[PDB]
């Protein structure tokens, strides 16, 4: 829902879900591109922490 002004005051769960989906899309694209080992380890580790 927005506030008086009009800027949408967004919830925290939307930040969390949007982070997980951004990272998951990045990880699918790197497994498409066949990135090396350390790149996809950091990518999966950032998804795990997300």
């Amino acid at each position: 829902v927005p506030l008086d002004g009009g800027r949408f005051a967004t919830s925290d769960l939307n930040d969390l879900y949007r982070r997980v989906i951004n990272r998951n899309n990045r990880l699918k694209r790197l497994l498409d591109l066949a990135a090396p080992d350390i790149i996809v380890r950091n990518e999966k580790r950032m998804l795990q922490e997300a």
Binding site: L33, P36, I38, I39
Partner: protein, 154 residues
């Protein structure tokens, strides 16, 4: 011999990280310890001394290397690293020019109101460079002429 390494930067300031890295090299004049810098990850041709490691992590807006450990960080691990880089470049340089369709061949439309629609080419005209394909719009087939680039081969 200089081997490759992966550097993590603040994603978005990557060109400025690359420029500041070249400038820190030409400041602390370890010119014989750095080969190139390739572009959120920055590829660095390098050797491993602890002095050069402190140099790259003292470059601003750089988090650190990505490897097995932080004592002795890791070069690279890919069967075809050159082919992976070629695939990344091919993503940006996508040709996508499939349009060749004979009679009875299905095609795809991605231009004009007929975009996002498929159909078959009942007649073809290489001389006029036009394909005769109809689109199933509201059921009835809508025989329309589309260019090879205007439609994609299905």
């Amino acid at each position: 011999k200089k081997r490759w390494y992966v550097v993590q930067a603040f994603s978005g300031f990557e060109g400025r990280v690359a420029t500041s890295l070249r400038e820190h090299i030409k400041l602390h004049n370890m010119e014989d310890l750095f080969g190139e810098v390739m572009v959120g990850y920055v590829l660095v041709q390098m050797v491993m001394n602890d002095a050069s490691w402190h140099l790259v992590r003292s470059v601003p807006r750089v988090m650190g290397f990505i490897g097995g450990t932080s004592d002795r960080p890791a070069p690279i691990s890919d069967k075809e690293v050159d082919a992976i880089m070629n695939r990344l470049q091919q993503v940006g340089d996508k040709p996508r020019p499939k349009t060749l369709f004979e009679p009875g061949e299905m095609v795809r439309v991605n231009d004009g109101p007929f975009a996002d629609f498929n159909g078959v080419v009942e007649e073809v005209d290489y001389e006029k460079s036009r394909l005769k394909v109809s689109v199933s719009i509201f059921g009835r087939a809508t025989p329309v002429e589309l260019d090879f680039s205007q439609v994609e081969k299905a």
